[PDB]
Symmetry: C2
Subunit: 368 residues, 2 copies
Amino acid sequence: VPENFVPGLDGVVAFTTEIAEPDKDGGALRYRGVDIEDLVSQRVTFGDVWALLVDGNFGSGLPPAEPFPLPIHSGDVRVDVQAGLAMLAPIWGYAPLLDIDDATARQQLARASVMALSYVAQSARGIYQPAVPQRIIDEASTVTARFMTRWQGEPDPRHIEAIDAYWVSAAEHGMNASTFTARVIASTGADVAAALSGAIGAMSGPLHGGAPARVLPMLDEVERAGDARSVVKGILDRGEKLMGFGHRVYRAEDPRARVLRAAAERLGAPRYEVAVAVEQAALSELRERRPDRAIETNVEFWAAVVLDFARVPANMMPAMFTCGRTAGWCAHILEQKRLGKLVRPSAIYVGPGPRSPESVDGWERVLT
Amino acid sequence: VPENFVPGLDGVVAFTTEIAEPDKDGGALRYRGVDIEDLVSQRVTFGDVWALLVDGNFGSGLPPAEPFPLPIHSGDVRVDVQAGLAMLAPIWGYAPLLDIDDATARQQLARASVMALSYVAQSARGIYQPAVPQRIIDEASTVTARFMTRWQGEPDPRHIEAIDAYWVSAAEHGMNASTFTARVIASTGADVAAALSGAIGAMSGPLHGGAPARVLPMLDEVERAGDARSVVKGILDRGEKLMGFGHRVYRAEDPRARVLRAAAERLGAPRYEVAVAVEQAALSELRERRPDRAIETNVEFWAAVVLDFARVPANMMPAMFTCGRTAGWCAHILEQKRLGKLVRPSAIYVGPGPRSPESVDGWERVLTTAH
């Protein structure tokens, strides 16, 4: 037993990556050395950012999704895509990562990744309404535009811009619980379909983080009252928790939160005026009751505003975060494939010592 | 900014566990301090050993499976159960692990674990054959007996004992890759359905280990030829590698392999004599060619013989190992829930430095909109 053993691999370095660098001490996020704020400002679509993270160079984009309607209908969009991806291996003949070269692995990843987006659009649209015809979908020119058309039918072009802004900013942010899970499964040599399915499972956790905040009810109280300061004061005074704000992640303002806020004003989001007022009031009050800590806006606050601007429901937002994070997942799965090392930590036994089966409680309730 | 880095968390202590002790130096395996070789010797069914690992005591064994026919037919038995388990949460209303007490999580794990057995039995039986009536299944007593009845229709009692031997010996063997995957997903607060589904995905990997070895073609040849030593010699000479024999896992013979060989002989498996003959020939020839290495019989070798004796096909064997490991997964998922600590390591960036998009190879091929 190591003294002062810290569980959870907290701070332990497991991997070395060339994919992306969250420079928290410098307040910037770079994909293969390219700042995400440059990518969004020059309007690089999510399809190409997927290539940059996975391949390392601008080039072979994310292929158009192929006609394959969703076979899973559970009412939970996370469950539908997680179970749907796992079933792609037998039908598409996905060999284990141990038996394929890097070129095949990438194409399998690109095929399954864009198929995951198609599932989420179908699940969001629901089964109580006919699907969008393929001829209509083919009129779209980008992967993000295809997702909006498959889901909404006649999407607003501004909403398509907002989804690209969100998906690029959420594509890859270092070692997560989900990204770690994807690499652990891939380290076992399993096919890419199972690795992506497991990553979605870890993504569904409340403690994983990065999921858009439940701030829409808060943005309605300010809409009714018309005074952001009083609503923020009330929640704190009444003993409730203020949502979308907390301790800083970067050294300062999160770059993703900055670009998402800039995306809201640039696209004329109706909630933008209220959202800024809530943000100013929430920070003035929170920094006043504890002026010694550093308190900055959570990226999840502006993620909720931008997704809501694109008609994304509250129960669909976690799927949207999963859709963008497929870029980081596939890149890390491919990098883990080249590493060729299995992840196998160790545990230290602190349980009971040797004992006969009869000495254990409840032995008389066992037969044979 | 690295050091003499050893990637892969090799030997790094991540958790402390009270569940089971893989005593590799001592050459024994113990569930909650109870030797597996004592559990099998007294014929404790898989349901009670599931209770021992999760609970810590032999009370409140594994409940009977409820009628719920498999909705997933993909052609891969692993895929059917991995996708089927994940679909259980919306219909059964499983809340996330963060929002339930320990008593509920134990019940949800037991309900889903026995359902995973039901899926594997149904998927193995196949869609080209009417399902076994529930009243026929109800005539069984143990959980293992129900699994064989739901699959085979009229199972042989010896085959049922062969599975209780295998499932107990493969229920828990420490912090393997799949158990680690289950604990990581559970630490995020996700519901037990997703944690079990993720564990099966990591199980499917060829490098996870424990998947029963493909020794059946080799055991077929020795039966035809009758010269076990020659067949072993022939396989090595022409560049192939023998199946089920490699580097040692423990200091010496694996007790899991020992009890499986003992079970194969106790139940009169038709392949036992041919398997012992091959094992003796394999060890003799392998240790002569590499005297400086410790070669031991893999547990996968005798696992394949025992599963084959119980009429388990080759492509069903990886699913059978998944069925047994649900005991260890559920115990570790429950232990992780009480720990209440997210698992998140870190990484060191060694990639390219800051650069503009125009300086990236292939920028000329990115189409961008601009109003």
